[PDB]
Amino acid sequence: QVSTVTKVIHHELEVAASADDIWTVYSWPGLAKHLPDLLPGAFEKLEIIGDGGVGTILDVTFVPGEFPHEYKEKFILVDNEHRLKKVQMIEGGYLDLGVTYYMDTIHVVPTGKDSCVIKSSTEYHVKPEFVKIVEPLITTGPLAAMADAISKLVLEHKS
């Protein structure tokens, strides 16, 4: 049995809003329900199972054509002290393409009174034979699109 491969991807978005202002949205139990009210064209559908807080499960279906089709995500952790959120893919998606573990992390870091950076990362463990296949497919795209969307929600509410 040959060693599992670990891969990390990282995206950052500078924002002219305080780390609180941006954490309040990422940590908002009602963020999940707002998601099409933020990223149209992405989702065919989005079932939510729970309160919207830690332990909530998202069933996500994308518009016919593009990969993956479906998958389920679970809110694993919110830490208001560190402004750190973790979201794990628990079923479908890449997990049917030899990925044994896929975890999104969002860290909102202060850079002075009225500004912060959104540090989004993804860590995955993949069976070494599938690395050629999945490495081109797992991109920041999803977390970049969330960082952009949240950023432009907040800058319009603060302005």
Ligand X SMILES: Oc1ccc(CCNCc2ccccc2)cc1O
**Residue 108 sits in the site that holds ligand X (CB under 6 A):** no
**Residue 154 sits in the site that holds ligand X (CB under 6 A):** no
| Cα diameter, the chain | 56
Whether 119 sits among the annotated catalytic residues: the reply is no
**Residue 54 sits in the site that holds ligand X (CB under 6 A):** no
Query: Which residues from 8-47 bind ligand X, rule CB under 6 A?
Result: 26, 31-32, 39, 42
Nearer to ligand X, 18 or 104 (CB): 104
H or E element in which residue 68 lies = none
Catalytic-role residue among 45, 85, 86, 152: 85
Integer angstrom CA distances of residue 3 from 14, 90, 124, 131, 133:
37, 22, 14, 12, 17
Q: What is the nearest approach in angstroms of ligand X to the Cβ of residue 83?
A: 12
Q: Which of 84, 106, 116, 138 touches ligand X by CB under 6 A? A: 106
Give the phi and the psi of residue 120 in degrees, each rounded to 5.
Answer: -100, 130
Whether the Cβ atoms of residue 117 and residue 16 lie closer than 8 Å to each other: no
Q: What is the nearest approach in angstroms of ligand X to the Cβ of residue 69?
A: 12
Pairing mode of beta strands 116-126, 57-62: unpaired
Pairing mode of beta strands 5-15, 116-126: antiparallel
CA dihedral of residues 118, 136, 74, 150 (deg, nearest 10): 30
Q: Name the residue with the smallest CB distance to ligand X.
A: 142
Q: Which of 60, 118, 138, 147 touches ligand X by CB under 6 A? A: 60
Residues that bind ligand X (CB under 6 A): 26, 31-32, 39, 42, 58, 60, 73, 85, 87, 104, 106, 142, 145-146
Catalytic residue positions?
A: 85
Residues marked as binding for dopamine? Answer: 71-73
